[PDB]
Design an enzyme around this catalytic site. Structure first.
Site, PDB file in Angstrom:
ATOM      1  N   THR A 136       0.897  -1.238  -0.025  1.00  0.00           N
ATOM      2  CA  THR A 136       0.009  -0.008   0.173  1.00  0.00           C
ATOM      3  C   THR A 136       0.986   1.210  -0.158  1.00  0.00           C
ATOM      4  O   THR A 136       1.779   1.489   0.729  1.00  0.00           O
ATOM      5  CB  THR A 136      -1.042  -0.039   1.128  1.00  0.00           C
ATOM      6  N   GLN A 137       0.406   2.164  -0.825  1.00  0.00           N
ATOM      7  CA  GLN A 137       1.212   3.555  -0.954  1.00  0.00           C
ATOM      8  C   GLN A 137       0.212   4.538  -1.250  1.00  0.00           C
ATOM      9  O   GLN A 137      -0.969   4.348  -0.940  1.00  0.00           O
ATOM     10  CB  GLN A 137       2.319   3.651  -2.021  1.00  0.00           C
TER      11      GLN A 137
END
Ligand SMILES: *[C@@](C)(CO)[C@](*)(O)[C@H](CC(C)C)NC(=O)[C@H](Cc1ccccc1)NC(=O)[C@H](CC(C)C)NC(=O)[C@H](CCc1ccccc1)NC(=O)CN1CCOCC1
Ligand SMILES: [Mg+2]
Lengths: 235, 233, 231, 244, 222, 211, 240, 250
Positions: free
Chosen positions: B1-2
């Protein structure tokens, strides 16, 4: 020394060929396929009279519609039977149906050549896998440690195999009844066995569509032996 | 996740009688800052495919490298690499779509929305979309981001259904795309005047136009607008 | 002699004996023939039985709708390699939406077999394969040897007595290549080719095995009364 | 490949013997004799150092008798380096048991564990076995005073009196002759030294060529004391018993 | 925070006849209030006289179908080109779904075909593999709009025979393919009126012993 | 859901409704919540439909391989324990199962409650599901050991009806089973709609409802 | 890891390592098993080459696997400990997972399976051990007696012997043991077991161990004096 | 690849001999002579710097090595094997002791760790034994001064004085006549130089002899002041000049 997975100059795997020699020393097992069912019979061959013969288990259930007889180093068959039973039940889990006899046999034969330097050597046992399914009907397969399997109308494995196979060559026809096949296995077993055939040193079994795989009682086989003696004395 | 950092906005495209058109502006935004003004977001793959990408630019540059490597790999032990066994738009798309869905399934997505535009071997038009979730769909017109809200309505007035494709010429289709890019410049706060346009025709091949500008803009009416209600001066 | 104990050992003349012994297993195997035109590709295989009560061992295996092979030698090794081809054909479809090129399928088989010839502990594959297929560049026929060598051909044959069929195809080259849009005539040429490798025994209904693939023809196998037409 | 150079340490002979175990026992037969004698009120451990030198520092030396815990000790016969590997494992096992159950490890349980480790090297791994034979002398509140032996085969047995190493045949005969069940520690001390004195390959049995130890309830009230004898103390007991 | 799921809308409907079965679904693909495609097929011929539709999160639906098609392919390879029965496919699909019990396929799924006695069959699946054979089933966005209508017009629920006044039910007479297709079109036309995610087009796949046939009907585009 | 089972002189009765729910929406009304593991073993389902279905079908395959290796039908206790140990691995991970393993073996009729929380309990009477609380009232008040098969079947049926009436998430139809030493016997599917009115008239109960 | 294939086939179809493991069993001390009408007796030889032994603490030849099953053996002593430990662990594992103690047939099948596994696994040699497994199934009064060997084969026996000079004692049992009427009591069963060992043992002093197993987990080991009384009575009848 | 030699290369022969260990001891016999002598107030270890070439700078090759501040080592046999053992010995003194107890290990326990490493090379798969015998001299608070020998087998013995390598048999005899329990460190150094001269052929001076002592604490070699309890290393390597000074009074 030399590799376990080594080819000979003739193009055969040494170890596979040597395991076939061990199977020739094993007790006799015979299978006959008919349109009314497949019959499986074995020589028990107890090493001593004190050995309780009913504990000798050379005919085995894989599923309700598949049976199995063995010959050779019988201890090696246990993990093969275990895999076969797991394969049969696993397929019922995934597909909500009985597994094809050929597919079951193919699964067992996939283990055969998984040896090297996996297990350390090939299996020293041959199997007669008999069963029934809706697609191809009553079937009999001969599973070897080479990973090869042939379908047969009739087949004998073990020490009296080539003598029994020649006898099965003459006797088998496509219109055999189940009762006729039962007597035929008993006849050929009695011929190749060292000791005198009776209900305690020989065992019969069959697979039918209706009743499934059944091992015969010693009382039931005894009557078929008595029926055999009388019909041979009839001419 | 970013989270996406440097981003590219809308990519728009449509089918016409003999091929496909695709366009995208040359901007790499850094939040509200219009940081990078010379960013190419249309990436040709051979002479029959153009991949238009929006979203995170670092992930775009990664995908650009995967595609460049795909061409290299396809040529390996392939005497027909510039002929029968050349890369097709459908091959290139399925590869990307496979990668995008795998990355979302590891909870580490490529933060992009991609449109693959091209013409197949048999002359058929190819136009399909894929995004960070692995979601795919095809339509006569396709657009990402703001383009989905503003460009598609305009392009669907030209090609409303499949049967309108043969009736649509390259001059009409290009005109519609260029108009849509003007509208996005009026209304998208993360857009630029400068853009690139690519045409893939089954007859005339790949035409790649750079350094295009939005022109014929309407601003003169602004002089008459005074205040927010009651003010007259 | 002293250099045939394992696959990891060259002989003084630069030979690999374990690979050569694996090659020998193919020569013991039953004959199978491959040939193609510009539109179709055909496999013909002579199946072998154990005895009269036994079935005839299957020789042909389907890999995909557009590709398959025939085997000669260790059947289990053919099952392993064909399973690998099935997976590779399948990877190409699922990932790239692309039917695997026959030439590339040959390159993959070559590289898989090679790894077994250079490492200690393992053994070479003991089977030869004839791969046929129809892809974007038309019909194809490949010959696989477990040394790793793969060869694209117009026609060929492997197994016992395969030299007779191979000579016939070498004469007929100009004729059967032109058999376009006529599957039955191409099979006839294959059945006539495999007949040059027969001795004592002849082609019966449960003996013969045929497979075909082409322009508008998926890979299909013919056995039993389906090949009585060609006997 | 590598197969060419493999000795195959874990295989049967045609007669059903383990080659390496038998050859390890042959090695041990050349080691210094160690004797263990169990009495009603204690245990004795005696052992002969192998052809020493005058320049060997004896008071800081230890090649035969080792302490496993406060209740259990061992006499070694064979490769000392191999023995120390096993001794450290046994010390750890004894402490693991104590940590788990909050009670001192029973003698047999410790012996079985070490013997199982030895067994493993004869059945799998392809490594040579440990060329070591132990005499375990120990005490616990179940069986009281106990003597055990283990050898490279991993087989162990209990004893009233036993010898390992060199001249065990001769030594075991002498022990079998003079041993009695109602024997005491002081008498057992005398028997052990007399047996070594007759079986030794050396010209004479002296203090500098011996290691000696006792496990006695001769500790103030119901408890057990281990005594590893010092060089001067071995010299005194040799005079007391009338050997020097 | 990254959300790995999405909602692409759509609605599907399966009805089993006496010797046939239908699987219908709209062709509209959406995100939020936007239309992605007016014609994006959702019902597929998977082989062996089986049709399938999995959707909700399009990406998960596409993957499941793709995997099941693959499962059929390998069923032929491994079991001598044997035909995969509808009941066997259903059980197989359960195991595809439960293999991701802890990261589910976010989809509604329905398959249709013929059973081994030749009668029509419809199976319904929840996202994690609970499946049921049914005569009539709708799935997706407008499932709740359609199912009550089918309870009434296919199974004759709450319908009694006049004159008896609730004493005798309406007898369960079978439906023809032509009568069924009318219920399907009326179901989707009604759902299009009251559900915003339903519209554009309607694709129906009919399964008989002869094979799989398609029919397409337009729906409102608003 | 509502499910129940109880031991008695002539074996064990097993009963269950058929409703499946997704919030307030009734997704299905034809669910089989009783799974046939073998001709002598039944399993009930409550909670996660997918969870209950998968794990009990996987158990039936464990019970079958047991019969093959051992030449002996598995006991009710062993079967229940295999399930319990299987679900215990995934404890706290989100599984939702409430099951009863009913059967007849060497020790006579057997009945075990097993859930995803970790419980495994032997008992003569159980009821699990959202409507269990309503069913317990009827069971406890009328349950004997000396109950006829006819009266026992009715009790289990009447108990589900009580719950199906009151509980919003229970209803549809009643599935009945009777397990003997010769195996289980299916005793039909009974629509609650029709059954309710029938019972009301014949029994006199549900006087508050008009019909 | 050490992967070498030690157990392999030879040209004549023999696995020598397994056959050489049987030679280790032949060397081992004699063990005998006899089942009566309502009991099973396990007899074991103790070689008297080892005196000065502490019989309190020395590992006994008969080992309890569970409260209702026992295991005796012939062959390598160290190898037998590994099988016994595994069998004991499995016995508790079975009680833990299935809520029943193992049947004698099941325990035998497990031990035999372990022995077989060591005949086709890389880097390991076969167990040089044959076992006699005896006991009574839970809630059953039928005596059970099984035998295993290095190859992994197992079978049930009315009476059986293994180890050195087992050929002689088997000869004795074959003519003395009647199947139609087995030893009706414990005395008759023990007497026949002691008689059989007296054909081989040498002295009837501390060389014979006897362990009687009865139904419902009733297992007891006879003492020296109790056995000595059997030895006395047998020879006094023999002087005639 | 992979290390496929997972089996022992050292095995028992029919006679009970461990061949590779015996052969390792033979390599030690061929090696240059080294010795050690223990005094009342110190220990000395010494050996010959057998230079392979006169162009080679023999100062760069250190046969006598510091293991801890109070423990030193010298060898006979194969030099490279010694060099790696010193690296491992230095490290194991930290990892298996100093990082746990906050102090350097006593001589006997460091010796025990080195011995263990050498024993494992005698049993582990795909390795040969180390071809060296070590002499380890050291001091610690509770055991005082001590001198240990370690062989290829992993066996170790404590010595009052001893010698290993080429002329060990003659050297050990020489030491037996000269050694007593009242020797001062300077007397032991003198005896060491006398003993070592017998086994040396060529030049005999400070540049061809390597000699170190374990003796008094050296606060001048500590490198810092301010902590009373830290008094400096007891290990000290004698210089070329310091050796030559004692060769005049020889
Ligand atoms: C009574 C009827 C209710 O307590 C019973 O207990 C029955 C038991 C029978 C069905 C075996 N239980 C249910 O009806 C059960 C209640 C429930 C729901 C969700 C979790 C646990 C228990 N219902 C289900 O299992 C339904 C069955 C469907 C309708 C056929 N399944 C769902 O609701 C699925 C499964 C969801 C899921 C579980 C675990 C991990 C991930 C997902 N969910 C959906 O279909 C999504 N749902 C659709 C409706 O809109 C909201 C989202
Ligand atoms: Mg379990």
């Amino acid at each position: 020394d030399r590799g376990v997975s080594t080819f000979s100059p003739e193009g055969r795997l040494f170890q596979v060929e040597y395991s076939l020699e061990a199977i020739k020393l094993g007790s006799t097992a015979i299978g006959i396929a008919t349109k009314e069912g497949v019959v499986l019979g074995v020589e028990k061959r107890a090493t001593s009279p004190l050995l309780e013969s009913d504990s000798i288990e050379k005919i085995v259930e894989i599923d309700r519609h598949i049976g199995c007889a063995m010959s050779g180093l019988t201890a090696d068959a246990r993990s093969m039977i275990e895999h076969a039973r797991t394969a049969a039940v696993t397929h019922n889990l995934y597909y909500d149906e009985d597994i094809n006899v050929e597919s079951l046999t193919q699964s067992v034969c996939d283990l055969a050549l998984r040896f090297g330097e996996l297990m350390s050597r090939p299996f020293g046992v041959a199997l007669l896998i008999a069963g029934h399914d809706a697609d191809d009907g009553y079937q009999l397969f001969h599973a070897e440690p080479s990973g090869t399997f042939y379908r047969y109308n009739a087949k004998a494995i073990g020490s009296g195999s080539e003598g029994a196979q020649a006898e099965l060559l003459n006797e088998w026809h496509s219109s055999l009844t189940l009762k006729e096949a039962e007597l035929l296995v008993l006849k050929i077993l009695k011929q190749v066995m060292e000791e005198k055939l009776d209900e305690n040193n020989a065992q019969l079994s069959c697979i039918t569509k209706q009743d499934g795989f059944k091992i015969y009682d010693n009382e039931k086989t005894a009557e078929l032996i008595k029926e055999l003696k009388e019909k041979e004395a009839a001419e | 996740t970013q989270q996406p950092i440097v981003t590219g906005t809308s990519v728009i495209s449509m089918k016409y009688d003999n091929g496909v058109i695709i366009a995208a502006d040359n901007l790499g935004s850094y939040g509200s800052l219009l940081r990078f003004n010379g960013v190419e977001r249309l990436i040709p793959v051979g002479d029959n495919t153009v991949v238009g990408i929006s979203g995170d630019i670092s992930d775009m540059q990664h995908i650009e490298r995967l595609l460049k490597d795909l061409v290299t790999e396809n040529a390996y032990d392939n005497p027909l690499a510039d002929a029968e066994e050349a890369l097709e738009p459908s091959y290139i798309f399925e590869y990307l779509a496979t990668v995008m869905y795998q990355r979302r399934s590891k909870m580490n997505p490529l933060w992009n929305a991609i449109i693959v535009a091209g013409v197949q071997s048999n002359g058929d038009q190819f136009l399909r979309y894929v995004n960070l979730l692995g979601v795919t769909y095809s339509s006569p017109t396709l657009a990402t981001g703001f383009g989905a809200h503003m460009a598609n309505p305009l392009l669907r007035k030209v090609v409303d259904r499949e049967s309108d494709i043969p009736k649509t010429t390259v001059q009409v289709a290009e005109e519609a795309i260029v108009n849509a890019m003007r509208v996005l410049y009026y209304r998208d706060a993360r857009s630029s005047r400068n853009f690139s346009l690519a045409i893939i025709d089954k007859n005339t091949g790949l035409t790649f136009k750079k350094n295009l500008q939005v022109e014929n803009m309407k601003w003169d009416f602004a002089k008459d607008i005074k205040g927010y209600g009651t003010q007259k001066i | 002699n002293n250099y045939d104990g394992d696959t990891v050992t060259f002989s003084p003349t630069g030979r690999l004996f374990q690979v050569e012994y694996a090659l020998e297993a193919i020569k013991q195997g039953s004959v199978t023939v491959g040939l193609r035109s510009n539109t179709h590709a055909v496999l013909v295989a002579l199946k072998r039985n154990a005895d009269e009560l036994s079935s005839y061992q299957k020789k042909i295996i389907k890999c995909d709708e557009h590709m398959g092979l025939s085997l000669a030698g260790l059947a289990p090794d053919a099952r392993v390699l064909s399973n690998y081809l099935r997976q590779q054909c399948n990877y190409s479809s699922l990932v790239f939406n692309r039917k695997l090129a026959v030439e590339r399928a040959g390159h993959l088989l070559c590289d898989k077999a090679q790894k077994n010839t250079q490492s200690y502990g393992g053994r070479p594959y003991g089977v030869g394969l004839l791969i046929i297929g129809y892809d974007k560049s038309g019909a194809h026929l490949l010959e696989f040897q477990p040394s790793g060598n793969v060869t694209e051909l117009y026609g060929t044959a492997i197994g016992a007595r395969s030299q007779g069929a191979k000579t016939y195809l070498e004469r007929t080259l100009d004729t059967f290549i032109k058999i376009d849009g006529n599957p039955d005539e191409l099979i006839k040429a294959g059945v006539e080719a495999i007949s040059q490798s027969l001795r004592d025994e002849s082609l019966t209904v449960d003996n013969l095995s045929i497979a075909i693939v082409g322009k508008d023809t998926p890979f299909t196998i013919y056995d039993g009364e389906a090949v009585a037409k060609y006997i | 490949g590598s197969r060419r150079y493999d000795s195959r340490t874990t295989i049967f002979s045609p007669e059903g013997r383990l080659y390496q175990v038998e050859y390890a026992l042959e090695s041990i037969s050349h080691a210094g004799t160690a004797i263990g004698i169990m009495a009603s009120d204690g245990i004795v451990l005696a052992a002969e150092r192998k052809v020493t030198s005058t320049l060997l520092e004896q008071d800081t030396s230890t090649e035969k008798l080792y302490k496993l815990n406060d209740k259990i000790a061992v006499a070694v016969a064979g490769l000392t380096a191999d023995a120390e590997i096993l001794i450290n494992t046994a010390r750890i096992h004894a402490q693991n048991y104590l940590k788990t159950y909050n009670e001192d490890i029973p003698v047999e349980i410790l012996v079985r564990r070490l013997s199982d480790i030895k067994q493993g090297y004869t059945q799998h791994g392809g490594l040579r076995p440990f060329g070591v034979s132990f005499i375990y002398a120990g005490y616990d509140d179940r069986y009281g005073y106990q003597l055990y032996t283990s050898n490279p085969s991993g087989n162990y047995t209990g004893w009233k009196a036993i010898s390992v190493g060199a001249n065990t045949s001769a030594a075991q005969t002498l022990l079998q002759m003079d041993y009695k069940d109602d024997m005491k520690v002081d008498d057992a001390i005398e028997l052990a030294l007399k047996t070594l004195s007759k079986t030794t390959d050396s010209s004479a049995l002296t203090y500098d060529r011996l290691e000696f130890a006792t496990i006695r309830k001769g500790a103030n009230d119901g408890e057990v004391y281990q005594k590893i004898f010092k060089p001067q103390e071995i010299k005194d007991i040799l005079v007391k018993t009338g050997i020097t | 925070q990254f959300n790995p799921y999405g909602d692409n809308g759509g609605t599907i409907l399966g009805i089993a006849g006496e010797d046939f079965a239908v699987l219908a679904g709209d062709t509209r693909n959406i995100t939020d209030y936007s239309i992605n495609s007016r014609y994006e097929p959702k019902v597929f011929d998977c082989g062996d006289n089986i049709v399938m539709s999995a959707n909700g999160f399009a990406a998960d639906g596409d993957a499941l179908v793709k995997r099941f098609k693959n499962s059929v392919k390998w069923y032929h390879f491994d079991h001598n080109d044997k035909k995969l029965s509808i009941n066997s496919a259903a059980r197989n699909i359960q195991h595809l779904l439960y293999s991701r019990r802890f990261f589910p396929y976010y989809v509604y799924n329905i398959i249709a075909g013929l059973d081994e006695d030749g009668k029509g069959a419809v199976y319904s699946f929840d996202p994690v593999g609970s499946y049921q054979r049914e005569q009539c089933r709708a799935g997706g966005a407008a499932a709740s709009l359609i199912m009550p209508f089918l309870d009434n017009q296919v199974n004759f629920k709450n319908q009694y025979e006049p004159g008896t006044n609730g004493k005798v039910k309406k007898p369960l007479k079978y439906l023809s393919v032509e009568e069924v297709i009318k219920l399907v079109r009326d179901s989707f036309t009604s759902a299009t009126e009251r559900h915003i995610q339903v519209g554009d087009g309607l694709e129906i796949l009919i399964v008989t012993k002869d094979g799989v046939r398609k029919e397409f009907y337009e729906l409102k585009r608003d | 859901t509502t499910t129940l089972a109880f031991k008695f002189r002539h074996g064990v009765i097993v009963a269950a409704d058929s409703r499946a729910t997704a919030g307030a929406y009734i997704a299905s009304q034809t669910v089989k919540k009783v799974i046939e593991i073998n001709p002598y073993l039944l399993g009930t389902m409550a909670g996660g439909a997918a969870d209950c279905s998968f794990w009990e079908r996987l158990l039936a395959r464990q019970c079958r391989i047991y019969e093959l290796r051992n030449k002996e039908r598995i006991s009710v206790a062993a079967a229940s324990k295999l399930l319990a140990n299987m679900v215990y691995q995934y404890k706290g991970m989100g599984l939702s199962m409430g099951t009863m393993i009913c059967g007849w073996d060497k020790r006579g009729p057997g009945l075990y409650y097993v859930d995803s929380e970790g419980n495994r309990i032997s008992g003569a009477t159980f009821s699990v599901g959202s409507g269990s609380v309503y069913a317990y009232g009827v069971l406890d008040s009328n349950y004997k050991w000396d109950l006829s098969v006819e009266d026992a079947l009715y009790l289990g049926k009447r108990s589900i009806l009580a719950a199906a009436h009151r509980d919003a998430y229970s209803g549809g139809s009643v599935n009945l089973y009777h397990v003997t030493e010769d195996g289980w016997i299916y005793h039909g599917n009974h629509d609650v709609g029709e059954l309710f009115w029938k019972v009301k008239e014949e029994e006199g109960s549900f006087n508050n409802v008009i019909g | 890891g050490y992967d070498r294939a030690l157990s392999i086939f030879s040209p004549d179809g023999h696995i020598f390592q397994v056959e050489y493991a049987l030679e280790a069993v032949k060397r081992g001390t004699c063990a005998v098993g006899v089942k009566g009408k309502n009991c099973v007796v396990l007899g074991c030889e103790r070689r008297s080459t080892l005196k000065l032994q502490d019989t309190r603490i020395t590992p006994s030849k008969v080992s309890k696997i569970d409260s209702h099953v026992v295991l005796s053996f012939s062959g390598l002593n160290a190898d037998s400990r590994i099988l016994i430990e595994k069998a004991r662990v499995e016995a508790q594992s079975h009680r833990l997972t299935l809520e029943d103690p193992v049947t004698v047939e099941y325990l035998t099948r497990y031990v035999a399976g372990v022995q077989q596994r060591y005949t086709q696994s890389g880097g390991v040699r076969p167990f040089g051990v044959s076992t006699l497994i005896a006991g009574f199934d839970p809630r059953d009064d039928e005596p059970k007696l099984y035998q295993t060997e290095p190859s992994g084969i197992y079978s049930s026996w009315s009476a059986q012997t293994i180890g050195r000079n087992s050929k002689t004692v088997r000869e004795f049992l074959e003519k003395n043991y009647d199947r139609k009427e087995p030893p009706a009591t414990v005395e008759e069963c023990v007497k026949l077991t002691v008689r059989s060992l007296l054909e081989v043992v040498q002295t009837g002093a501390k060389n014979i161990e006897i362990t009687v197993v009865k139904p419902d987990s009733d297992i007891v080991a006879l003492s020296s004096e109790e056995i000595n009384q059997y030895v006395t009575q047998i020879e006094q009848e023999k002087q005639e | 690849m992979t290390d496929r030699y997972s089996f022992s290369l050292t095995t028992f022969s029919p006679s009970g001999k461990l061949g590779q260990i015996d052969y390792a001891l033979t390599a030690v016999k061929q090696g240059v002579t080294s010795l050690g002598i223990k005094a009342t107030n110190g220990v000395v270890i010494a050996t010959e710097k057998k230079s392979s070439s006169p162009l080679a700078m023999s100062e760069t090759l250190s046969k006598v090595s510091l293991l801890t501040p109070d423990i030193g080592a010298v060898y006979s046999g194969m030099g490279p094997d010694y060099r790696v053992l010193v690296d491992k010995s230095r490290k194991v003194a930290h990892t298996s002791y100093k990082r746990i107890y906050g102090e350097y290990p006593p001589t006997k326990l460091l010796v025990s760790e080195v011995a263990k490493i050498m024993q494992e090379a005698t049993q582990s798969g795909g390795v040969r034994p180390f071809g060296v015998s070590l002499l380890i001299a050291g001091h610690d608070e509770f055991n005082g001064f001590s001198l240990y020998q370690v062989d290829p087998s992993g066996s170790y013995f404590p010595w009052k004085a001893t010698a290993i390598g080429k002329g060990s048999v003659a050297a050990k005899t020489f030491l037996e006549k000269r050694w007593n329990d009242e020797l001062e460190l300077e007397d032991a150094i003198h005896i060491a130089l006398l003993t070592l001269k017998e086994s040396v052929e060529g030049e005999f001076n400070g540049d061809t002899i390597e000699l170190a002592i374990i003796g008094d604490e050296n606060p001048d070699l500590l490198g810092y002041t301010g902590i009373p309890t830290d008094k400096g290393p007891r290990f000290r390597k004698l210089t070329s000049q310091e050796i030559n000074d004692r060769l005049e009074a020889l």
